[PDB]
Amino acid sequence: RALSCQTLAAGYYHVCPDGLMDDGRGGCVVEKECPCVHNNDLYSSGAKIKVDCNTCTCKRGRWVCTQAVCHGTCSIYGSGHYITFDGKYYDFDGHCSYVAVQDYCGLGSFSIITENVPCGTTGVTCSKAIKIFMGRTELKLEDKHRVVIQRDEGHHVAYTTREVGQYLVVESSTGIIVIWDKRTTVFIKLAPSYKGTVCGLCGNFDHRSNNDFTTRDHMVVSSELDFGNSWKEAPTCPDVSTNPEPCSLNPHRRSWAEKQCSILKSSVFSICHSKVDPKPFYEACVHDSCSCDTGGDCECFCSAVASYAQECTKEGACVFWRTPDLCPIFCDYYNPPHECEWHYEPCGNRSFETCRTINGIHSNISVSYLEGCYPRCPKDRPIYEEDLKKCVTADKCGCYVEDTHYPPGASVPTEETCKSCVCTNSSQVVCRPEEGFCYW
Amino acid sequence: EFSRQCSHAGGRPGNWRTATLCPKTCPGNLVYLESGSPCMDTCSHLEVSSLCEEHRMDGCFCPEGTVYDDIGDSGCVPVSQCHCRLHGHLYTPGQEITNDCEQCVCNAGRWVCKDLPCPGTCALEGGSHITTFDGKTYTFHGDCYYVLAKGDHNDSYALLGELAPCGSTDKQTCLKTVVLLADKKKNVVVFKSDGSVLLNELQVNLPHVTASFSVFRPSSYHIMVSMAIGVRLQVQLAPVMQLFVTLDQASQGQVQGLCGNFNGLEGDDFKTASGLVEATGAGFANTWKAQSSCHDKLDWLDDPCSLNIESANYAEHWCSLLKKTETPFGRCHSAVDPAEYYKRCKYDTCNCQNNEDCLCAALSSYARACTAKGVMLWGWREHVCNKDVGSCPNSQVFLYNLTTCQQTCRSLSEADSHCLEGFAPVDGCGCPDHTFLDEKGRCVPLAKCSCYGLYLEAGDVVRCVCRDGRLHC
Ligand SMILES: *[C@@H]1O[C@H](CO)[C@@H](O[C@@H]2O[C@H](CO)[C@@H](O)[C@H](O)[C@H]2NC(C)=O)[C@H](O)[C@H]1NC(C)=O
Ligand SMILES: *[C@@H]1O[C@H](CO)[C@@H](O)[C@H](O)[C@H]1NC(C)=O
Ligand SMILES: [Ca+2]
Ligand SMILES: [Ca+2]
């Protein structure tokens, strides 16, 4: 009879004396002061940690956590790698427009589509554009820019587009969020009010992952290529039959790919090995490097490594892996002639003041873990205006009306009648009537 | 052209084409019109018009209702005639089907499905390859006793397993012994990897049927145990010890161990017994040690096919057979994807030091998963693992459908005491080819099987004359 604080629930079926039990940290301890373990880390009694929306506590060698429902996340990345809302990795290489997510599941309020095209000569395909239908408005993410289309006359469901780090973030007041890295990666986040009322390549988000392969006609299949083929949009698009194997069709490119992608398994990421399993990212890195055989193959690799570095940051391991010879980043390009304010933030853990949050506007998600270059505005004009990427005084930032920036003083355009508008010299947008009939 | 300009500017012209004024025809009841939306509903892609980013022109369209038929080949048929499809065959609106764990009926265009009970299976294969009740494959390489699976209530049962180093390095492990704790943990049964099953530290004889559970040994290389609670066990003793556990569907969420919780979600499978979820495969496993004295292990971020170069060519040349469509395994390609089995075949063949034994053990796992979904691989031992196919005893021959109740004369004497169901057919030496196994040696014909008490020769009489197998008592 020798308990150890880790065989507590085992049963002791098959040193410390009677009573006290080994804790794994040192001398014997009573059951009450028995510590807790998590991801190869040993926490004493009465500690605190957070898991993605909640907070926990090591009570009696056991964790007690709050119960709130975190958001739901779907991931699209690489040459056709998908992660659904309930955590089911898979691959699919199509050439058509596919329903990423939607609410018209057998009347609906939105839809998010994607556009996959071939990239390479081995047959693999990758995403290169996004379309967002909200009510009647249609946003399109394309050519590193956001384009509005068919803006509805007077409903104009409130959204917000901005740029954080290297990523472009589009949020909707209803509870939809899209994060786009401008090349191939996409994250879709949904609020917990949509639970079990969506369908598409990202599953139906019901905390149950044995039914995410539901086809368009409400049938559960067991094949990736049948689930994928049933969500194409144009009926004339062809059907996928087999998944190509890049590194087998391009033998001469293997040696390089297996050598560069090996950094994930090196000692550089030694801190993150106990928190995120690197194998499903190493496989994606090798798969992507063997396929980009028509040019610009140093860009397929850096994004693949960044996808894993971002998760390491998200779980609490800020790692600095870029070097002047490995995926360099050119930040100070944005600085004024020779005043140094923009800095490469390896893991984005910085909360500064913009002219949006200065007026009480706040988001609903923490995006404090995105890589990129960030400002460090000086002390003579410390408010970061986003639509121009400029450090300005608290007075002269902008107005931000109808998702359009307007410089202070500038006559604010208005799609109303008899209503002129101006951005005051106090960052305040104010409108007046004109009796030229109509009145106030 | 005037009409096209009329439509393009924003106007909507009316029909002018009559039967005598340049008419136009389309197949079926496709009526020609001007100024109608090209966004059509097609009996599969419904609600297209809500996402229509285009203006309208002329052409052949459908009436107000009667969405266009896409699955079939008719015209603008009504909505309540849409024929369903399922990997080919065109199912009519009213024809039913039964899928794996559910049954569906073709309603108007869309299936209506209803769940059916179907059990779950945990598998411990190879030296270290654990498949939970919800997939979630991972590799461990442990060294201790571990709690494979035990009923959570207080006592119901417990199933353990000895994972320990097997060759030279720590990275070559094996399963060495299976321990079962049942009957309120008042009975301990032990299976060692040499046969020699023993109960309460005492050797036992097979078959052994009791009130609570039972054990059988149909082919001398497979031990099959049934428990009245709803647990079923298969233990394979060659070429490498393996374990398969099957549970009913009335114990969903009441099991804990290395085999997960069996609740339908494969993300909380690594959920420790003390709250939060782990990230790696070794971190979660260490928390289920049955002996406090054992140490903790860590994952292994390497591929054995890169450390043993001389073995890589051998491993590839054979494990690649799984993807060859002309090979016997090519048949199974329709049902079960072979990619994971191929990768694990390479891993095991490169890693262990008995390369042929690991090759055969890995190759015999595909031919069990496939033989569970109907497709049965007949005669797949003709080139690869025929090392013992021809070694069967005098009248015995290697069979692929050697089930439990193809047994000797005494099995027919009762014929209903030990015919446990829900057990997959297994291979091995036998010959129940209407020649029922004799008391010993060659499998004699039905005429003189035996008269089973003791098994007498085919010349005795009780007045119940001794005859072929059965007795006219
Ligand atoms: C964060 O979520 C809240 C919760 O809805 C959003 O607040 C909504 O805002 C819209 C318009 O601004 C109102 O019509 C809703 O009534 C609000 N919701 C509630 C519950 O009051 C908020 O807009 C979201 N954040 C952003 C930046 O849009
Ligand atoms: C096994 O299959 C063979 C097929 O040739 C046939 O003899 C029979 O279906 C089975 N044999 C038995 C049940 O003894
Ligand atoms: Ca689901
Ligand atoms: Ca589970």
Residue numbers in the entry:
A (entry chain C): 780 to 793, 801 to 892, 897 to 1226, 1237 to 1240
B (entry chain A): 270 to 721, 724 to 733, 739 to 749
Question: What did the publication describing this PDB structure actually write?
Answer:
One extracellular protein family that arose through domain replication and gene duplication is the gel-forming mucins, huge glycoproteins that coat and protect the epithelia in the lungs, intestines, and other organs. A remarkable variation on the theme of mucins arose with the evolution of the complex vasculature in the vertebrate lineage. von Willebrand factor (VWF), a glycoprotein responsible for hemostasis, has a similar domain organization and is homologous to mucins in its amino- and carboxyl-terminal regions. Under acidic conditions, the amino termini of mucins and VWF form noncovalent intermolecular interactions that juxtapose VWD3 assemblies from different CTCK-linked dimers. We present residue-resolution structures of VWF and MUC2 amino-terminal segment tubules, enabling comparison between them and an analysis of the features that stabilize each one.
We subsequently discovered using dynamic light scattering (DLS) that a dimeric MUC2 amino-terminal fragment spanning the D1D2D3 region but lacking CysD1 could also self-assemble, but only at a lower pH. Remarkably, in TEM samples prepared at pH 5.4, the D1D2D3 fragment exhibited tubules that resembled the VWF tubules found in WPBs, both with diameters of ∼25 nm. The VWF and MUC2 tubules also both display twofold symmetry perpendicular to the helix axis. They differ, however, in that the VWF tubule is a one-start helix, whereas the MUC2 tubule is a two-start helix. The MUC2 tubule has a helical twist of ∼83.2° (about 4.3 subunits per turn) and an axial rise of ∼6.95 nm per subunit. Due to the larger axial rise of the two-start compared to the one-start helix, a helical turn of MUC2 (its lead) extends almost 30 nm along the helix axis, whereas a turn of VWF extends only about 12 nm. The MUC2 and VWF tubule maps indicated contacts between one helical layer and the next, which in MUC2 are made between the two separate, intertwined helices. The MUC2 helix map showed additional interturn contacts not seen in VWF. In the MUC2 tubule, C8-1 modules from each bead contact one another, with an interface area of less than 200 Å2. The MUC2 tubule also has a second contact between helical turns (gray arrows). The MUC2 tubule thus appears to be stabilized mainly by quaternary interactions between turns of the helix, whereas the more rigid packing of the bridge in VWF appears to dictate the geometry of its tubule.
